[PDB]
Amino acid sequence: MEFFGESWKKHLSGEFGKPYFIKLMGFVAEERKHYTVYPPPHQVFTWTQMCDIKDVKVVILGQDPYHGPNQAHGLCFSVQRPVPPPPSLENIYKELSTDIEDFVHPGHGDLSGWAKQGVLLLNAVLTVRAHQANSHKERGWEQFTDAVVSWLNQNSNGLVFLLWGSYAQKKGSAIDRKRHHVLQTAHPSPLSVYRGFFGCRHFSKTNELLQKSGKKPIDWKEL
């Protein structure tokens, strides 16, 4: 697989030969003949290029990639310059400013700095037709990302999973809470942020949990 991180390729290569995945790649290829699909080919697996698979420490599960021009770049919640941070990400920064004492709003929404430190920003569906939310759901991506979550669940220890919102909580329902830490709350979207996300303190809690398992904490201000 191209544009796919080496360490990830070594452990997930088995998925590449399965019927559902081969069908999925065919479907996405067909879609790109007739539509603009985001993210562009080289950014569909950005989440595998930022850090080694064994350096993953924290997992944040998302649902669908952004469907507007230049927004999605392979990481959930993240947008690259010059796109302004979406409402959900602004709410994430708000929580961070009250939770992590040294947090400074960077004025952009590119979360590459977190990905570099082992924060896996994984969407459940990895492509989308331009301007059409959820247009690529149930074509095989969910099985693939379930396989990625299953691999981490069984081959890693002491990961922190942040499950925000209904979709993420369902997808993360299979995580072994004896081996990993699971923090749950409402989605940071303006529509639900007041249902628990504000005040969840997931960022300091994550660092506290990482230390107790002997892992290096995330420097959340490092964006």
Report whether the peptide linkage leading into residue 39 is cis, meaning its omega lies within 30 degrees of zero: yes
User: Which pair of structure tokens corresponds to residue 135?
Assistant: 């247009």
Q: Which residues contact 194 (CB under 8 A, 6 or more apart)?
A: 186
**Residue 67 assigned ligand-binding role:** yes
CA nearest 169: which of 150, 149, 183, 148? Answer: 183
- Per DSSP, 43 falls in state G
What is the distance, to the nearest Å, from the Cα of residue 222 to the centroid of all Cα atoms in its chain?
17
Written as one string, the DSSP assignment of 180-196 is SEEEEE--SSTTTGGGT
CA distances for 101 relative to 85, 94, 169, 198, angstroms: 21, 12, 28, 16
- Is 187 among the annotated ligand-binding positions? yes
Please give the residue range of the domain that contains residue 122: 1-223
Resolution, in Å, please?
1.6
Give the DSSP letter of residue 88: H
197 is in an annotated binding site: no
Residue 83's CATH number = 3.40.470.10
Token pair listed for 127: 């492509």
Q: Per the annotation, does 166 bind a ligand?
A: yes
Residues with Cβ < 8 Å from 121, sequence gap 6 or more? 47, 60, 62, 75, 76, 77, 78, 111, 114, 115
155 in a labelled binding site: no
Beta strand 160-164 with 128-129 is unpaired
Domains held by the chain: number? 1
Residue of 64, 110, 176, 219 with catalytic role: 64
64 is known as an active-site residue: yes
169 annotated to a ligand binding site: no
Amino acid (1-letter code) at residue 14 = G
By what technique were these coordinates determined? X-ray
| Sheet (strand 119-123) strand order | 119-123, 58-62, 160-164, 181-185
